[PDB]
């Protein structure tokens, strides 16, 4: 009966726009946590630091180009670039060379007979700004610890997703928003003032613990607040905030080259939401799922007062249809109580894992697009807009199962097309990648809507975090899987991606259709889904 009161009081009102903006704020302050390693951990051109090279450079006044050419051993990178970015000339350069204009008097090739040692004086970087690998020297033998950032972030995602999902289900959406936003702000603030890498790793673990739960608790609140018809328009445009945050992250990263200033800049919307927190109330469906009737009635009265429309006479005694107890049972065994619910939970878990694996693979496989890193990130980020608009015009017309199925089938076909596509005519390969990424983004938005729609209110956050826990596992194992499979066969990850996409497209058809259906409230209501 919550939807009837929402319709009588007026859904998608001005207060709904205000709540939409202030809750989509999180979605804009969530991208630097997830994908901020692109700008906080970019690896510039580097080589070994030789004290004798600088003396000759100051003596002859050499320009940095030919000084770099005559200084590094590996002028030609040849892919690995270990001779340029790890090798140091053991022959001294402080003494006057035979010819300071590109000296080669060490040997016939000046590298074959001259011994090549590792870096001893540190590293230099050809960039006006700073980064993680710039500050902590993570380029030659410490390059594997750059991936530890994302690894700790995803492990925190998993663990804190489960924990914060249970916390949000038990103590409500508002208290979870308080806790996760506080820990996110603290974690960013001491991220930007971390002396060592271990402190950063611990704070990245904490950010992974709270950030995903914060984002999807806000998404769950903003989904439950609107009626049956505006769920599409709210849940699709909630990721417009993420896209806008991606664009703003790129712009502020171009504005601020140093990573500490970037973290200060991206830690600000969380504090400004802390300043503007009191403008959102709790979800009335969760309040009715806790036998707190008068708080939900007060929330409806406040919404009526803010919207300018008088509350109806039936707004009082707003209660559940068959409320018999507190309905406080957020359980991990609640999801697998029924064979139907266990089937849909396993389907959503496998679908989340497949979508995460496919998204990470499609992101990683295409990285040869040259130019600026900021322009590459803009091209990767702006491609989600037309597919999301295609979604926003196709959920209402078709539904929530067929667009997801087609999108997964299109992603699998695109993974099965670019394998047989020649390396020549790169424009076709780029547009095929773009089509596959478009379908993947549509499928991710569809599963984000469907996961939230197909669960009871008192199970919803915990059940989604259980279903979405396989995304972080896929994010962890995907780079290792693609690396070892690429070592085995040049195209084996592509066939595995196509197989996973085809099986995911086949699997999602067994999900119940939830087009034009109100959110379930009791245990029996979700058993009736589809
Ligand atoms: C990098 C990833 O793995 S997904 C990324 C983070 C994430 C992890 C979860 O487990 C929970 C859900 C999320 C928040 C996704 C939600 C949907 C996002 C925002 C996606 C990035 C782009 C997409 C699809 C197209 C669009 O319009 O926005 C989110």
UniProtKB/Swiss-Prot annotation:
Post-translational modification: Phosphorylated.
Keyword Ubl conjugation applies: no
Positions on the Extracellular side per record topology: 41-147, 196-204, 255-260, 367-374, 422-429, 484-490
Keywords for this protein: Cell membrane, Glycoprotein, Ion transport, Membrane, Phosphoprotein, Transmembrane, Transmembrane helix, Transport
Ranges in the topological domain labelled Cytoplasmic: 1-19, 169-174, 228-233, 282-345, 396-400, 451-462
Mutation effect (residue 238 to F): Decreased TEA uptake
Sites where a glycan is attached: 69
Location in or out of the cell: Basolateral cell membrane; Apical cell membrane; Lateral cell membrane; Basal cell membrane
Thermal properties of activity per the entry: Optimum temperature is 22 degrees Celsius for the transport of TEA. Doesn't show any transport activity of TEA at 4 degrees Celsius.
Membrane-spanning ranges: 20-40, 148-168, 175-195, 205-227, 234-254, 261-281, 346-366, 375-395, 401-421, 430-450, 463-483, 491-511
Effect upon mutating residue 22 to L: No change in fenoterol uptake. No change in trospium uptake. No change in terbutaline uptake
Catalytic activity: 1-methylnicotinamide(out) = 1-methylnicotinamide(in); dopamine(out) = dopamine(in); serotonin(out) = serotonin(in); (R)-adrenaline(out) = (R)-adrenaline(in)
Outcome of substituting residue 12 to F: Exclusively found in the African American population; increased MPP(+) uptake
Activity-pH behavior: Optimum pH is 8.5 for the transport of MPP. While optimum pH is 6.0 for the transport of the drug quinidine, no transport activity is observed at pH 7.5, possibly due to the protonation of quininide at pH6.0.
GO cellular component, one term: presynapse
SUPFAM superfamilies per record: MFS general substrate transporter
Induction of expression: In the liver activated by HNF4A and suppressed by bile acids via NR0B2. Increased by cholesterol treatment in hepatocyte cells.
MF term (GO), any: (R)-carnitine transmembrane transporter activity
Outcome of mutating residue 463 to A: No changes in MPP(+) uptake
Effect caused by changing residue 218 to V: Affects transporter activity; reduction of MPP(+) uptake
UniProt effect for mutating residue 86 to R: Affects transporter activity; reduction of MPP(+), serotonin and TEA uptake
Tissue expression per record: Widely expressed with high level in liver. In liver, expressed around the central vein. Expressed in kidney. Expressed in small intestine enterocytes. Localized to peritubular myoid cells, Leydig cells and moderately to the basal membrane of Sertoli cells in testes. Expressed in tracheal and bronchial ciliated epithelium in the respiratory tract. Also expressed in skeletal muscle, stomach, spleen, heart, placentacolon, brain, granulycytes and lympohocytes.
Effect of residue 374 to F: Decreased TEA uptake
Annotated phenotype, changing residue 83 to F: No changes in MPP(+) uptake
Protein name: Solute carrier family 22 member 1
Biological source species: Homo sapiens (Human)
Gene this chain is encoded by: SLC22A1
